[PDB]
Amino acid sequence: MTCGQVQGNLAQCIGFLQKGGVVPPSCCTGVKNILNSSRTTADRRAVCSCLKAAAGAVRGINPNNAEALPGKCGVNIPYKISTSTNCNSIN
Numbered sequence: 001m002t003c004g005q006v007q008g009n010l011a012q013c014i015g016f017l018q019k020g021g022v023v024p025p026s027c028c029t030g031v032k033n034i035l036n037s038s039r040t041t042a043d044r045r046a047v048c049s050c051l052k053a054a055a056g057a058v059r060g061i062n063p064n065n066a067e068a069l070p071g072k073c074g075v076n077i078p079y080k081i082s083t084s085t086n087c088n089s090i091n
Contacts, residue, residue: 010054
């Protein structure tokens with residue numbers, strides 16, 4: 001996990017997240033990557049600690065797409081795309 005790994009999640013989805021054109025298999029893949037292909041504890045707790053500013057970089061974004069983001073790839077995660085979903089008690 002880096003704060004660039006999360007970028008390959010949200011940066012792809014931004015082109016729908018911010019301007020809802022369409023959800024590419026790229027956005028999905030990056031999302032599912034940070035969520036499932038994270039694998040490690042550091043890739044879970046720290047990854048969320050990057051998601052905060054990545055979903056905080058939202059300039060002209062759409063919050064409705066933030067919850068759609070995980071749904072469109074098929075990753076119903078326990079924690080959410082919330083900027084304050086608490087990233088340490090996720091385990």
